[PDB]
Structure 1
Amino acid sequence: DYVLYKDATKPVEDRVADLLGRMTLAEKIGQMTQIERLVATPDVLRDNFIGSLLSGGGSVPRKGATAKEWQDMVDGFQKACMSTRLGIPMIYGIDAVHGQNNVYGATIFPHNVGLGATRDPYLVKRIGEATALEVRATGIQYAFAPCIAVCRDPRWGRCYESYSEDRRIVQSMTELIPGLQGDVPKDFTSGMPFVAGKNKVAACAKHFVGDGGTVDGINENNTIINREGLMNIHMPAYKNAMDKGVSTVMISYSSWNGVKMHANQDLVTGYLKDTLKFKGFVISDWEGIDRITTPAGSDYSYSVKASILAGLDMIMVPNKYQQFISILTGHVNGGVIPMSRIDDAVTRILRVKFTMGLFENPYADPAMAEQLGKQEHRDLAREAARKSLVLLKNGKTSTDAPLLPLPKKAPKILVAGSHADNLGYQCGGWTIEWQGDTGRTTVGTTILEAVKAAVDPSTVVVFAENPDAEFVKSGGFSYAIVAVGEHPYTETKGDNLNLTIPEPGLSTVQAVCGGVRCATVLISGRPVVVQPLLAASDALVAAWLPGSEGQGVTDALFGDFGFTGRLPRTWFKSVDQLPMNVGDAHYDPLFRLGYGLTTNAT
């Protein structure tokens, strides 16, 4: 007879109910299961009725894979899923968190902290738009973004993934969501999922909740704050996300007052689902349910019970799907987890899939491949990089001529420092590899390349990575641009109690600026100890992690545009002050939140 769920003209809720009513337990639990492409095969996907796949950081079909290679990979998986009895298409997720960043040749946008510096939500919306296109270029339908953490301590390795320590700024930047997904209709009910169609992607507000509030910025640790503080600081942007139709929410590894978020029924079900009326699906973090216990994974049966009863809908396993499916099936058969809970999880997963058009367009569009690294998107990244820059110093005394903007015509100039010609360093973590990497890892323009592209043809440009003082004094230079800062990092590898940049960095700045007037470009994911760098430098720019388009940096250095970025975080005098956020009683910053010098275009 007629099969309602296969009818594209029918309301989503009717299609959901019609399909749900046909499904076996195995088919239901399969929808709730997300697995790594590294463990996926056609038989696995078909036999286990798998609902989702992902690429974790650096999980790629081949180094240097083309957009079409990604499309072929995703379509291969999709063909297996579509060959099941019910033909429910899988959704494929990836961390596209500053562009489609795992992919070779994808445009790499500034990380969130720099976007916060721009105070420009419309810019961020347009970045969401470009990112959706580059993700769809690779056949992928689901981005694990935005991170709406409010980082309250820059010792956290994910501080760069937070737009600001100020929740108001984070709330404003939720505009990423309608960029990625499309704008919601005028009729729209807050909490409903939304994706406009095949040229957009499902988004994910993460990580719920208080991931940016952990003690001493220890990643995945305990957020110790009363309910009033949680609701006033860490929660608000989730409400904006509901209002904008975010399709999914990912749960945090962190705990709130000692209760694991992955086990917190009060917050996941009581608040997110029952109070905020969230109707999309809730996904775990990577082995998030494993990490409920100490040691992690030492009671996986408990992990499954606790997380599913808490209200999680989809589990990012991501590897041991056999164990997950077996345990969950056992719990349901034994009445420990009710069918109502399973049906709710599946209802939400199917709701997102039908809403976004996945049943109508389960396969990649080969015409989209050329969206990857498209020059217009690079022009946008370049605009964002330039707007993110915060000018902290522009002259050593009130009597000095401002160093910036620099003249494009000079007899000879010096470009120096570990970060002047290192594309991987300027992109930071979550670029090609999970932890990021060093050197020419993708298509882009380094600061050195940007300088050479900007200056008058008569200007001789000399590069020296770590010149000594004599080299500089003898070189006949008009000025120097020197770039130094943090190495790429992600998650726990970035947790750092001292926040001092690696050497050589300061020593290079001192040697260069001791010999010639010098503009220091600081590449970092966060405020770092900066007084010594300031003391040496004529001008100093906090460039954050500006991404693949290094010309954004030189657009401001050479006065094509004026500096406009303002600190989205407090710049501390010392790490012993931390945590120290705007509005605190003891507030003694080196530079307050919102500080930034300006220049005018030449």
Structure 2
Amino acid sequence: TLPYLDPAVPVADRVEDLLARMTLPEKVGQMLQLDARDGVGPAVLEKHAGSLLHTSPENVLAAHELTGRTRLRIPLLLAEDCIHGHSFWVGATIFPTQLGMAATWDPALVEQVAHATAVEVAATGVHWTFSPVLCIARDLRWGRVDETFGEDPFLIGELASAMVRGYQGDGLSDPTGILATAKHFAGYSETQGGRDASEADISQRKLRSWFLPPFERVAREGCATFMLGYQSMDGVPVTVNGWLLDDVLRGEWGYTGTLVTDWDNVGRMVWEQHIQPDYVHASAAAVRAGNDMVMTTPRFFEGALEAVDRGLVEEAAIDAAVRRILTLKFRLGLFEDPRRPDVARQQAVIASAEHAAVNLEVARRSLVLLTNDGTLPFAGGLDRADGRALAPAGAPARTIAVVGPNADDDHTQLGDWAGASGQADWLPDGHPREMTTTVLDGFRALAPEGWAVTHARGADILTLAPDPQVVVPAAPDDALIAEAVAAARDADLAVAVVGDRIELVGEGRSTATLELVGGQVALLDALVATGTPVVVVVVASKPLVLPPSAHAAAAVVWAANPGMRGGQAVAELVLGLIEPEGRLPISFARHAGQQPTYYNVVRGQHGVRYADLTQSPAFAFGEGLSYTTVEYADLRVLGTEHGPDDVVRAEVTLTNTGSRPVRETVQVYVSDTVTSVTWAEKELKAYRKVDLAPGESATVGLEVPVADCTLVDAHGRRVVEPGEFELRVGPSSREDALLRASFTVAG
């Protein structure tokens, strides 16, 4: 032989030969992506599904057998949330979350993470990951901040670009490449209240200004699929948003990839957004809008068939979507090799030493040292003879008390979209306890022979009660507090590991207050009051408001969810076996009502502060300490006048005036002095990592293409306007940390 089965026949002819043989239910079936947890049998055989997601290892094997019993034997696309590692394969390598990864400011490293993930994913027979996430974290109340690369469009684009390259490899014939997904297109991350898929009050120009740029980048770089957002934007759900899908994605960007909806997008237009009277009309709307894959709306099957039968849409529209789906399957070679799981390759590559080394590198470089009174590195810093550290000169016996609810919690350390986080039902125990080094594990393994490591839980966070169940913050626990206070009073250092956990994170779980829940604030107050130096380690999904006692503690480390090696990286940082390198990809609010606290705030406000609160963030985008001092000086623009096709070139001089080496992340912001429409005060446009030995000075070149110095004007065009600009260069987005030099652009 049949021509669609002949690999010598051109793809377009194979597609036409198969399409002409399909019944309409078989064609509608190809548009369906169904939840395999509900039973692969009916999905493959009765609904003729084109794709499955959340397919357990036993159901992947069953799905291939079922395909063999179908009339046309069209291979399935098996898709999965493989979000920061192969989230739902027991024993896979689980990396930090994207938010954690973004603190490395290292696209080359993030590409290694994505490539390592795809290698593991491919060995399990999954073809397609719903990753990377390109949402921009502009309201910290949102439950899914942990899934973003932070608050900056340029850095998001850098790191999402790296993920797509790493996942897709050499292309559709690469055996270790998988399809990437640009999600969640677009505007999902900034909706009313920071709630999950509440209304997006985002105009066309606002979306173009702060949300689209990373999506346009990965579209142009060949991201195989896009996922359409759950949310209504200016009253129109993305699933039927013609401006966004046709004018922007297909038209302005010329995108030729394949679309998939988010979970039950089509159905939600009936029962949650209340914009369609029934499933037939919602199905017709989704077809008319140009959707391809419809994720987990089972009733699209009968709804689209009735819509065609009633003349609401043409069978030709179904054909157009199936043509695109079949083209993808043919180009992946799935009719010749359906890419079944391979046990021998799973044993060779899943959680390989290779992959664990990448994971350790990301964990080590993601930790952000936010405050330090000199207590760190502890006892002046330690040396090794990998392996246990030696007691340093002048500190033969020390005791480190490791306390707090997140100090020994391996599930919470890995975060959402991993293990037992809840979206997959075949990982009851999550990932093997084996594979995660908690903070307590890390200190127990690295503290010198001669030092002691003690543990006390100190505080609980929450319990669940009936109304899904609702969170009940843990009560005061004087006995639990007093046990941790006793450990600290008998210690030289108290390492308090605090944060959030899964019931306070993710879909349907935005938070209003951003505060530590349960007994954690009381624990931190009591610990600091002992006079033993306290290091607060925040293991949490997103930036939290920390209590006054955390700001009075000796040091504060931000770890996001640092993955399987995170606990080793934490102990190494505290003990000085590594230098800190992480830099914040996101700003920390002092109060939920303080927002916006992202750095790229649009100008115009009457005043600089709330009457009851500063507008200065607790910690700002790009901030983060090392164990040395670095002086920035002598920022110069080399030729200040520019035409549109030129490059802004600059130099700055850095000096390591301290005693330890550093990898410094130089950050380059552009400010547009006079804008035709109101605009951000500044935006990150470039950055550079610079290694500096103690006492070393270096003059490093910097550049920003003039073409990147854009704004979105009143006509919705992203343009460089002639006029004055400032280049702002320094170690963070804090204005008092930035050198500045003027430049101009002329027509």
Return the TM-score normalized by structure 2.
0.72
Residues 41 and 306 of structure 1: is their aligned pair in 2 closer, same or farther, counting only changes over 3 Å?
same
Residue 533 of structure 1: how far off its partner (Å): 4.3
Q: Percent identity?
A: 31
Residues 417 and 377 of structure 1: is their aligned pair in 2 closer, same or farther, counting only changes over 3 Å?
same
C-alpha distance in structure 2 between counterparts of 1:158 and 1:431, whole Å: 14
Tell me the amino acid that sits aligned with residue 361 of structure 2.
Answer: E
The more displaced of 2-11 and 238-247 is 2-11
Tell me the amino acid that sits aligned with residue 426 of structure 1.
Answer: Q
Retained in 1: the 8 A contact 2:440–2:455? Answer: yes
Matching of residue 143 in structure 1 with residue 122 in structure 2: no
Matching of residue 526 in structure 1 with residue 542 in structure 2: yes
Retained in 1: the 8 A contact 2:138–2:598? Answer: yes
C-alpha distance in structure 1 between counterparts of 2:14 and 2:446, whole Å: 56
C-alpha distance in structure 1 between counterparts of 2:620 and 2:69, whole Å: 58
1:481 to 495, 499, 502: 495
Q: Secondary structure at the match of 2:265?
A: coil
C-alpha distance in structure 2 between counterparts of 1:426 and 1:83, whole Å: 43
1:64 equivalent in structure 2: none
C-alpha distance in structure 1 between counterparts of 2:209 and 2:175, whole Å: 36
Residue 268 of structure 1: how far off its partner (Å): 1.8
Q: Secondary structure at the match of 1:419?
A: coil
CA displacement, residues 114-149 of structure 1 (integer Å, 9 cap, x when unaligned): 111111111111111111122123221111111111
1:75 equivalent in structure 2: 61
Matching of residue 286 in structure 1 with residue 302 in structure 2: no
Residues 537 and 329 of structure 1: is their aligned pair in 2 closer, same or farther, counting only changes over 3 Å?
same
Residue 353 of structure 1: how far off its partner (Å): 1.6
1:26 equivalent in structure 2: 25
C-alpha distance in structure 2 between counterparts of 1:497 and 1:267, whole Å: 30
Residues 534 and 196 of structure 1: is their aligned pair in 2 closer, same or farther, counting only changes over 3 Å?
farther
Matching of residue 592 in structure 1 with residue 620 in structure 2: yes
Retained in 1: the 8 A contact 2:269–2:282? Answer: yes
Matching of residue 455 in structure 1 with residue 485 in structure 2: no
C-alpha distance in structure 1 between counterparts of 2:508 and 2:137, whole Å: 16
The more displaced of 370-379 and 480-489 is 370-379
C-alpha distance in structure 1 between counterparts of 2:381 and 2:529, whole Å: 18
Bigger relative contact order (CA 8 A; separation at least 6): 1
Tell me the amino acid that sits aligned with residue 286 of structure 2.
Answer: S
Matching of residue 247 in structure 1 with residue 233 in structure 2: no
Give the structure with the higher percent strand.
2
Residue 196 of structure 1: how far off its partner (Å): 4.0
Retained in 2: the 8 A contact 1:152–1:213? Answer: yes
Residues 122 and 344 of structure 1: is their aligned pair in 2 closer, same or farther, counting only changes over 3 Å?
same
C-alpha distance in structure 1 between counterparts of 2:540 and 2:312, whole Å: 48
The more displaced of 213-222 and 350-359 is 350-359
C-alpha distance in structure 1 between counterparts of 2:197 and 2:593, whole Å: 22
CA displacement, residues 45-93 of structure 1 (integer Å, 9 cap, x when unaligned): 13432101111xxxx74xxxxxxxx1x5313202212432322100111
Residues 473 and 295 of structure 1: is their aligned pair in 2 closer, same or farther, counting only changes over 3 Å?
closer
2:533 to 517, 524, 527: 517
C-alpha distance in structure 2 between counterparts of 1:434 and 1:16, whole Å: 39
2:319 equivalent in structure 1: 343
Residues 496 and 474 of structure 1: is their aligned pair in 2 closer, same or farther, counting only changes over 3 Å?
closer
Tell me the amino acid that sits aligned with residue 317 of structure 1.
Answer: T
Q: Secondary structure at the match of 2:502?
A: coil
The more displaced of 526-535 and 402-411 is 402-411
1:93-242 to structure 2, matched below 5 A, reads: 93-174=79-160, 175-183=162-170, 194-242=171-219
Residues 438 and 75 of structure 1: is their aligned pair in 2 closer, same or farther, counting only changes over 3 Å?
closer
CA displacement, residues 193-236 of structure 1 (integer Å, 9 cap, x when unaligned): x5343322111110111111212311111221221221121111
Structure 1 gaps, min length 5:
62-69, 184-193
Retained in 2: the 8 A contact 1:451–1:554? Answer: yes
C-alpha distance in structure 2 between counterparts of 1:401 and 1:417, whole Å: 20
2:415 equivalent in structure 1: 428
The more displaced of 287-296 and 26-35 is 287-296
1:485-504 to structure 2, matched below 5 A, reads: 485-489=499-503, 490-504=505-519
1:50 equivalent in structure 2: 49
Residues 152 and 547 of structure 1: is their aligned pair in 2 closer, same or farther, counting only changes over 3 Å?
same
Q: Secondary structure at the match of 1:519?
A: strand
Matching of residue 545 in structure 1 with residue 531 in structure 2: no
Q: How many residues align?
A: 570
Matching of residue 273 in structure 1 with residue 250 in structure 2: yes
Residue 534 of structure 1: how far off its partner (Å): 3.0
Give the structure with the higher percent helix.
1
Return the TM-score normalized by structure 1.
0.89
Q: Secondary structure at the match of 2:78?
A: strand
C-alpha distance in structure 1 between counterparts of 2:430 and 2:451, whole Å: 25
The more displaced of 372-381 and 517-526 is 372-381
Retained in 1: the 8 A contact 2:79–2:129? Answer: yes
Residue 270 of structure 1: how far off its partner (Å): 3.1
1:243-392 to structure 2, matched below 5 A, reads: 243-295=220-272, 299-318=278-297, 321=298, 323-362=299-338, 363-370=340-347, 371-392=349-370
Residue 470 of structure 1: how far off its partner (Å): 4.8
C-alpha distance in structure 2 between counterparts of 1:470 and 1:112, whole Å: 35
Retained in 2: the 8 A contact 1:424–1:438? Answer: no
Q: Secondary structure at the match of 2:536?
A: strand
The more displaced of 270-279 and 412-421 is 270-279
Residues 465 and 39 of structure 1: is their aligned pair in 2 closer, same or farther, counting only changes over 3 Å?
closer
CA displacement, residues 466-511 of structure 1 (integer Å, 9 cap, x when unaligned): 1526513541x22122211111244344301100011222222233
Q: Secondary structure at the match of 1:211?
A: coil
2:713 equivalent in structure 1: none
C-alpha distance in structure 1 between counterparts of 2:296 and 2:6, whole Å: 32
C-alpha distance in structure 1 between counterparts of 2:571 and 2:27, whole Å: 54
C-alpha distance in structure 1 between counterparts of 2:492 and 2:137, whole Å: 40
Residue 316 of structure 1: how far off its partner (Å): 1.0
Residue 294 of structure 1: how far off its partner (Å): 4.7
Residues 206 and 577 of structure 1: is their aligned pair in 2 closer, same or farther, counting only changes over 3 Å?
same
The structure with the larger Rg is 2
